[PDB]
Structures are given as structure tokens and as C-alpha cells.
């Protein structure tokens, strides 16, 4: 079955700024990936985004009750649903599991990659820093970036390229909204000599 | 800059007659409606503790999406969708340790239309038991993403692959994991 396909999408979007102080509602209609018509609460009426949507913007904007409903959506829909979901979405905070390990078993005084694996956290905003004997390392730091697991958790792996020497202590530090106190995990080069 | 975004995302696809109705918060699924069973399906059980959604309302919306699709298909002179093949990544949920239960994640990203076949393979054989998957998740570029999951017990003996088939690909796409 390789028959041609035809896709309609609709996205009713609520964008929230400073809690619910400012809200923007978008009613967005798509043919394949192409948005063709949109209501934006900052505009207050439908507008064609492409020529495919011209017939709809005119037709819907001529219905007064229809527009009044869309214009109230910032409250009836957006702020309403924010309130419903707040405790388990906006206020969801899941503390990270942090593991530090060398990427390969290597003798000291040779190149290695030290891995700081930060797993299972929420929300996505995070800072992960590497230190060598208390001095922050900025160069030779490579990461996976932020990875969504699909289950309302994230992970990231943050790697430090280094040549570890006897007696050195490397530290991975995590800053994240779930923390009530600092999160650091050490790797001692003398523990893997 | 915005703090949060909630999206009610829907689609209807011809000639498959397939549809979807879901809510997204900052890129994660809150729920979708199983329109065969007319049931609200929460992404995490805990979300249904306090919140509710009238699943029948989704069917009404999908009927409008169908009617709209018919109109837009005519307006476009039957311009069909261009297939965009997925980018696939296999991940583990946590750092892997021998004989410590873990989960393989197959992340299927940046594709359309929202029709895909995903099969977990253990030593080349399809795994049917213990697997789970998400519905199609919307992207800001109006493509889709999806996750498939396989709980597993890590061993030196087993190898795994996520096999993905999509109209945009020239062959099945295999992404490998082994210890």
C-alpha cells in the first residue's frame, strides 16, 4: 500500500508567561505540515496563513459568536486547563539519579572520558558542571544534550576528556529545580589506579 | 520568554481513516483518547488522580477533522503529503550494568505521515511481550515523534535492534544496541 496520503492537523495552543499573567491562545489548522489558517488571541480574529485558508478566515470571522468564543479561550480554556493540570505538570519536580564513571577502564596518565550520567529528572532545565580538584573545567566537555525519554523524565550524559593523575578528584555538579541542597558526585583517580 | 505550553493536538489521515486526539505539556503527552474504546488514556496513571476528560468530546472533534480534511484535499487539487523519513535513536533508560533490569528506548523522530511500523528485535527475532509504545507526538515543525520501549535484563549474550519501516525510507531502518 503506497497510495497517496492526506493529513489534517489541528493544534489548539496555550502559551503561558509568568505563571498565568500573560497567556496567548492559538487555534491552528494544518494540511500536511502547512498551517493554512490561525486564530491568535493577540490579533483577535482568524487570518489566512496560506491561500488554502483564505475561505475559512473570512467565513469564521463573519460569525460573531464564534469569534467571541475564541476571544474568551485564554480564560475558558487556557487558564482553566493550567489550573487543572498545575500540580502534576507545572509543579512536577523529579530528582536526578547521578552516576559518574570512566568510559573505559584505562590506566592513569592516559586519555580517558569521564561520564556524568544524569538520569530520570524533570523538568528539563538543568546545568551540569565538571570540576578537577575544585577548578571548573570548560574545555573538553561534550554532552548528549537534553534527551526526552517520553515518560516525563529526561536524561543527559556529560563527558569530560581528561588525563587523570594519581590523587586527583573530579566532581560532577548538578543544578536543577528539584534540589533542596547541592548535588555533587566525585570520582577519585586513586580509586581506579 | 514563555514558561509553558499546553497543546491539544489532533490529526486525521486519509485514506487510512486514522486519527488522534492528545494533549501535550512542554513536549510530553498528558493523555490521548483511545477512540475505539472511547476512553481517556493518561500517560502516567497518577495524572488521572484528580483530572478528568470526557473522551466522547474527542470523537466530535475528529469528525470535524475528517470533514475539514475532505475540504482541504479538494482545495489542494489532491496534493498528497511528501514522505519525510524518520531519524531513529536507541537509548537506555539508565547506565547499563550486567543483570540489572533496564529499558531500551527506540526514539523515532522528525517524520510524517504518522504511520510507522516499529519492531523490537532480540537476536533478530521480533519481541511481542513486555513492549510498550506511545501514540504519535506532535513537533513544532508539524512532523511527529514516537517512542517504543523494551524492558530487558542486560547480558553479554543478547543483541537488540529497533527496526523502523516508513514510506520515506528506501529499506527497513535498523538501530542497534548491545552491551
Amino acid at each position: 500500500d503506497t497510495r497517496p496520503r492526506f493529513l489534517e492537523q489541528v493544534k489548539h495552543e496555550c502559551h503561558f508567561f509568568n505563571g498565568t499573567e500573560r497567556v496567548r491562545f492559538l487555534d491552528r489548522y494544518f494540511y500536511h505540515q502547512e498551517e493554512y489558517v490561525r486564530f491568535d488571541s493577540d490579533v483577535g480574529e482568524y487570518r489566512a496563513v496560506t491561500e488554502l485558508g483564505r475561505p475559512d478566515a473570512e467565513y469564521w470571522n463573519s460569525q460573531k459568536d464564534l469569534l467571541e468564543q475564541k476571544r474568551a479561550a485564554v480564560d475558558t480554556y487556557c487558564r482553566h486547563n493550567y489550573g487543572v493540570g498545575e500540580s502534576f505538570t507545572v509543579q512536577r519536580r523529579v530528582y536526578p539519579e547521578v552516576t559518574v564513571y570512566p568510559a573505559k577502564t584505562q590506566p592513569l596518565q592516559h586519555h580517558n572520558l569521564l561520564v556524568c550520567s544524569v538520569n530520570g529528572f524533570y523538568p528539563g532545565s538543568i546545568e551540569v558542571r565538571w570540576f578537577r580538584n575544585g577548578q571548573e573545567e570548560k574545555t573538553g566537555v561534550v554532552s548528549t544534550g537534553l534527551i526526552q525519554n517520553g515518560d516525563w523524565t529526561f536524561q543527559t550524559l556529560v563527558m569530560l576528556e581528561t588525563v587523570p593523575r594519581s590523587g586527583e578528584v573530579y566532581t560532577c555538579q548538578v543544578e536543577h529545580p528539584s534540589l533542596t541542597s547541592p548535588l555533587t558526585v566525585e570520582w577519585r583517580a586513586s580509586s581506579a589506579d | 520568554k514563555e514558561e509553558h505550553v499546553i497543546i491539544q493536538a489532533e490529526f486525521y489521515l486519509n485514506p487510512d481513516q486514522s486519527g488522534e486526539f492528545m494533549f501535550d505539556f512542554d513536549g510530553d503527552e498528558i493523555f490521548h483518547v483511545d477512540m475505539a474504546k472511547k476512553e481517556t488514556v493518561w500517560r502516567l496513571e497518577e495524572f488521572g488522580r484528580f483530572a478528568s476528560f470526557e473522551a466522547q468530546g474527542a470523537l466530535a472533534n475528529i469528525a470535524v477533522d475528517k470533514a475539514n480534511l475532505e475540504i482541504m484535499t479538494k482545495r489542494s487539487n489532491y496534493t498528497p503529503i511528501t514522505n519525510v523519513p524518520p531519524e531513529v535513536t536507541v537509548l537506555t533508560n539508565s547506565p547499563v550494568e550486567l543483570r540489572e533490569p533496564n529499558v531500551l528506548i527506540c526514539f523515532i523522530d522528525k517524520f510524517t505521515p504518522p504511520v510507522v511500523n516499529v519492531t523490537w528485535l532480540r537476536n533478530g527475532k521480533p519481541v511481542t511481550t513486555g513492549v510498550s509504545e506511545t501514540v504519535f507526538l506532535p513537533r513544532e515543525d508539524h512532523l511527529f515523534r514516537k517512542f517504543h520501549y523494551l524492558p530487558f535484563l542486560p547480558s553479554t549474550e543478547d543483541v537488540y535492534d529497533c527496526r523502523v519501516e516508513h514510506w520515506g525510507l528506501d529499506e527497513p531502518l535498523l538501530k542497534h544496541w548491545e552491551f
Binding site: 467565513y59 469564521w60 | 482541504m72
Partner: peptide
């Protein structure tokens, strides 16, 4: 509490 559904508008058959 109940999550509110946004309605879809119906395109002009034109």
C-alpha cells in the same frame, strides 16, 4: 477537575 476541550471550526465547503 475537568479538562476543557477546544472545539474545531468547520471549513467552508468552498
Amino acid at each position: 477537575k475537568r479538562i476543557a476541550k477546544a472545539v474545531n471550526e468547520k471549513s467552508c465547503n468552498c
